[PDB]
A paper describes a structure:
Analogues were prepared to establish structure‐activity relationships, while molecular dynamics simulations and crystallization of the inhibitor‐KRASG12C complex highlighted an unprecedented binding mode. A series of boronic acids were coupled to the corresponding bromo‐substituted isoquinolinone to yield four analogues 3–6. While a complete loss of activity was observed when the fluorophenol moiety was replaced by a quinolinyl or a difluorophenyl group, conserving the ortho‐fluorine and replacing the hydroxy group by a para‐fluoro substituent or an ortho‐ethyl group allows for the inhibitor to modulate KRASG12C activity in the low micromolar range (5.0 μM and 8.0 μM, respectively). Crystallization trials were initiated and a crystal structure of 3 in complex with KRASG12C/GDP was determined at high resolution (2.0 Å). As suggested by MD, the covalent inhibitor does exhibit a different binding mode compared to ARS‐1620. The most obvious difference is the rotation of the isoquinolinone core, which allows direct hydrogen bonding between the ligand and the backbone atoms of Gly10. In contrast, the carbonyl oxygen of the covalent warhead is coordinated by Lys16 in a very similar fashion as the respective moiety in ARS‐1620. Also, the terminal difluorophenyl head group is essentially in the same subpocket and orientation as that of the fluorophenol in ARS‐1620. Consequently, the isoquinolinone core and the head group are closer to a coplanar orientation (146 °), unlike ARS‐1620 (70 °), as illustrated in Figure 2A–F. In a retrospective analysis of the trajectories resulting from the FEP calculations, a similar rotation of the core fragment was detected for 1, explaining why this scaffold was selected in the initial screening campaign.
Residue numbers in the entry: 0 to 169
Write the structure that this text describes.
Amino acid sequence: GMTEYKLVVVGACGVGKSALTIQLIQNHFVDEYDPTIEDSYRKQVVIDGETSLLDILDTAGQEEYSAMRDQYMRTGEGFLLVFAINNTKSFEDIHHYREQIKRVKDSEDVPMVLVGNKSDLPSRTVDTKQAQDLARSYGIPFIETSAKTRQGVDDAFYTLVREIRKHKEK
Ligand SMILES: *CCC(=O)N1CC[C@@H](C2=NC(=O)c3cc(-c4ccc(F)cc4F)ccc3C2)C1
Ligand SMILES: Nc1nc2c(ncn2[C@@H]2O[C@H](COP(=O)(O)OP(=O)(O)O)[C@@H](O)[C@H]2O)c(=O)[nH]1
Ligand SMILES: [Mg+2]
């Protein structure tokens, strides 16, 4: 058979939410994608031998409340918390996005994965160990990605699916 998963990608403007999503759905690096476009994208993949349909909300728009976004967030099964390893502000912004997920879900038990994107860049400002400290504090996995090289992209999304499977067993 197959399982559907409703996934959400959150993070600061410019961290690579769209680039990561397009790497999953189309398998290449799209370096210019309208920063204002918020949409959901469907892709059929196979995860641990099971046909898996991923619906992925690629967040954009504004920081303020959007009704359609909120109603999608409320029913999201798993969230990727994306920062860029060369942007300390995007890392500091993770707390903000995680709080909004907990506020909109009725749960302190929401599948999430912390994603350090742009791992290909030499201009790192956030140490892997700092990200590991934070993911540990949340009790969630940390995955390093490059939407440019596709390094870690399947690991980020498939790890989130594995976290949802574990949550559904409870
Ligand atoms: C380049 C522009 C861009 O990508 N952004 C501008 C606003 C930024 C933004 N990112 C988010 O991830 C986000 C998430 C939420 C939200 C809503 C509901 C919920 F349960 C959790 C959330 F994290 C609201 C606003 C934004 C704004 C991205
Ligand atoms: N070098 C590098 N650039 C990236 C990576 N991911 C995204 N980008 C670039 O970072 C910018 C923002 O990407 P985008 O997907 O629009 O970010 P979003 O605002 O979070 O949707 C664009 O110029 C992308 O080309 C990456 O992993 N490595
Ligand atoms: Mg985008």
